[PDB]
Amino acid sequence: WDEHDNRTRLAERIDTVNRWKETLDKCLTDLDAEIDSLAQAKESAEQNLQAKNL
Amino acid sequence: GLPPAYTQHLREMAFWDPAITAQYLNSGPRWGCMQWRDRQIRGKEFVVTRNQFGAKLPWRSDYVPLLSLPQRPRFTAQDFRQRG
Amino acid sequence: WYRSNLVSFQESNSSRHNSERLRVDTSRLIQDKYQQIRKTQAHSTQNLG
Amino acid sequence: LKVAQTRLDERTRRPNVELCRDMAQLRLVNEVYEVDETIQTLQQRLRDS
Amino acid sequence: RSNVELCRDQTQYGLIDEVHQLEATINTMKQKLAQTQNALDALFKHLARIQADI
Amino acid sequence: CLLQEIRQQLNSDHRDKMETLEIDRGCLSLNLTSPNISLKVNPTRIPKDSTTL
Amino acid sequence: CLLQEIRQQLNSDHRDKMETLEIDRGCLSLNLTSPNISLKVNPTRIPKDSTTL
Amino acid sequence: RKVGERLEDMHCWKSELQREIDELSSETDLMMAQKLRLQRALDATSVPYSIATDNLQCRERRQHPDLVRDYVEVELLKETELIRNIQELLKRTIGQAVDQIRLNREHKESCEMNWSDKVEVYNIDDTCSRYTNESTQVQFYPHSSKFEE
């Protein structure tokens, strides 16, 4: 039964680690979306700047 | 309808990683370690893929030609024993 | 004599179990890989069109 | 893999401007690498067998 | 484990605990074996005496 | 640029935790009557960094 | 012996239905802008065996 | 006397294989550190490529009667090529590194298991050697052939 107790501890540790994993995964996906949006914003601003000489 | 990593790479400014693709969708590869090989010993079992998960199994494509074993989980339609 | 025969039967049973579980996992792997490869090819061809 | 390679290679001939970063070169490297590691894993399972 | 993800948890402590308990147990079994052998030897001496008397 | 370094650090952390995952799940799967098991030198040793929870 | 013929006919049925499975899966798979799409002869043809549900 | 000779002979090999496993572990830690260093360098690599791309775009942003091609663009192309080549070089090198890691750990495990075995056999030999004729742990059995296997 000491062996059984150790097994249970290991299982709960696994559960905690995996939930933290999925949290960071969703964070990374949101980060990617935001990066793309900021990119497009920057190029748009640049083309607006280019038009300022006529 | 396209992954944001793919969309980012199909843009002028260079921001993508120095790797093949995104990685959170991926797994053990991209420099994983701790490869567990089983030495064949007569006397002991030969358990493979010690990555035993516990996870969502579609019990759908399950035709083993001869699984006459203490196995074939869920339904079995089996007997218990005859003792002796 | 009894010791040796017991050991022999144990070896046999262990081999049986290992063989069967290996069968199961290989069976799984075949079809999953096949289907994903099919989908990946089809998407590519369509977008090229 | 052979067919995917053959599809990938030719687009070098595209002379001056139609030379493009495209769906094809984006998807093909990923597909190729996936199939390579797939075959290697198959070989692993085979030596196990 | 990893570079900085090499952490000491309660599982480590527990494993050391079962280790120590197990060596204690091994000592206990050797001790008991000793007296078992002593009793068997005494029985043998008794039987030899009885046979000579017979 | 700031978001770039944020991204790379997040990737590093993710790979760290995943490695931990495969390691400890292999540990769970291992049980009695195992092929590579053996008595070992000073498993009572201490790690050299000893990070806390 | 009886169980033997039962098992063989059930296996035959199994292969039949799985074939139908991949056939219908491909039928869902294709769509517009395909390379293999082409005008065929007599789409209006009727099958010869003429079985039903 | 013969038993004592055999015991000391065993003790020797126990000692050196102890120490051998020790330095193997140390060297494994060293390659851990160097692999991590290479990973950090690869992490640092990325930024100048983006800088060069942005600079090329900015230089492209110019007016009609003034735009030329000189050292600037050519050397920027050289920069980019060097960057990319360094990238795949680092990838391949670190791959071979991790493979070496795998081999070293396997050899560690094998030598460790053999060391373990000599440990237990030595312990049992020492424990058994304490026997004397008058003491306990003294039993009659029948003989056998695995006695002589």
Pairwise CA distance, residues C2 & G41, whole Å: 75
Please, which experimental method was used? cryo-EM
CA distance B2 to B11: 13
**What are F25's two structure tokens?**
């799940």
Tell me the chain E residues in contact with residue H137 when contact means C-beta distances shorter than 8 Å: 33-34, 37
Assign B83 to helix, strand or coil: coil
* B33 and chain H in contact, CB less than 8 A: yes
- CB-closest option in D26, D33, D48 to B9: D26
Mutate to test the interface with B, among H53, H77, H80 (most CBs of B within 10 A): H53
The shortest C-alpha distance from H8 to chain B (Å) reads 31
Q: What is the dihedral sign for C-alpha A45, A46, A48, A52?
A: positive
Long-range contact set of residues B68-76: C-beta below 8 Å, sequence gap at least 24: B69/C16, B69/C17, B69/C20, B71/C20
- Residue B16's contacts (CB-CB under 8 Å, 6 or more residues apart) are B5, B8, B9
Instruction: Quote the CA–CA distance of A2 and A18 in Å, as a whole number.
Output: 25
Question: Contacts by A35-43 with C-beta closer than 8 Å and gap 24+?
Answer: A35/B4, A35/B8, A35/B15, A35/F3, A35/F7, A36/B4, A36/B7, A36/B8, A36/B11, A38/F3, A39/B8, A39/B11, A39/B13, A39/B15, A40/B11, A42/B13, A43/B12, A43/B13
| Spatial separation of the C-alpha atoms in residues D32 and C44, rounded to whole Å | 13
Chain A residues touching residue F3 (CB < 8 angstroms): 31, 34-35, 38
Measured from the Cβ of residue B31, the count of other Cβ atoms closer than 10 Å reads 15
H64 touches chain A (CB under 8 A): no
CB H139 within 8 A of CB E40: yes
| Cα gap A24→B82, rounded to integer Å | 54
| Residue B44 bridge partners (DSSP) | B42
What is d(CA B63, CA B61) in angstroms, rounded to the nearest whole number?
A: 6
Amino acid in the structure at residue H59: R
The residue type found at H52 is A
Contact E8, F52 (CB under 8 A): yes
Which one, of B14, H36, A40, B24, lies nearest residue F4 by Cα? B14
Nearest to A14 by CA among B48, B51, B24: B51
Q: Which long-range contacts (CB under 8 A, 24 or more apart) does G9-15 make?
A: G14/B63
Check if B14 contacts D (Cβ < 8 Å). no
User: What 3-state DSSP class applies to F51?
Assistant: strand
Residue in this structure with the two tokens 């001869």, named with its chain if needed: B66
Instruction: Classify residue B77 by its DSSP letter.
Output: -
Alpha carbons H50 and F3: distance in angstroms, whole number = 13
User: What is the distance of C-alpha H73 from the center of its chain?
Assistant: 44
Q: What CA–CA distance (Å, rounded) separates E5 from A13?
A: 14
- Asked if residues H42 and H83 have their Cβ atoms less than 8 Å apart, the reply is no
Compute the residue count for chain E: 54
Rounded to the nearest 5°, which phi and psi values hold at B26?
-90, -165
From the list B78, G29, G4, the residue with the least C-alpha distance to C42 is G29
Written in H, E and C, the secondary structure of chain E is CCCCCCECCHHHHHHHHHHHHHHHHHHHHHHHHHHHHHHHHHHHHHHHHHHHHC
The CA-based angle G22-G25-G26, given to 5 degrees, is: 90
- Exposed / middle / buried, residue H127 (Cβ in 10 Å: 0-12, 13-18, 19+): exposed
- Counting DSSP H helices and E strands in chain H, the numbers are 3, 0
B67 phi and psi, to 5 degrees? -100, 65
Give the up-direction half-sphere exposure of residue A9: CA atoms within 13 A in the CB hemisphere.
Answer: 13
Phi and psi, residue A53, nearest 5°: -115, -20
Residues 6+ apart with CB under 8 A from E12: none
Shortest CA gap D42–chain C (Å)? 9
- Residue of D23, D31, D48 with shortest CB distance to C40: D31
D49 close to B (CB below 8 A): no
Three-state DSSP state, B71 = coil
Nearest of A21, H30, A29, B19 to residue F19 by alpha carbon: A21
Q: How far apart are CA B52 and CA C36, in angstroms?
A: 22
For tokens 């550190």, what's the residue? H33
- What tokens does D37 get? 């590691």
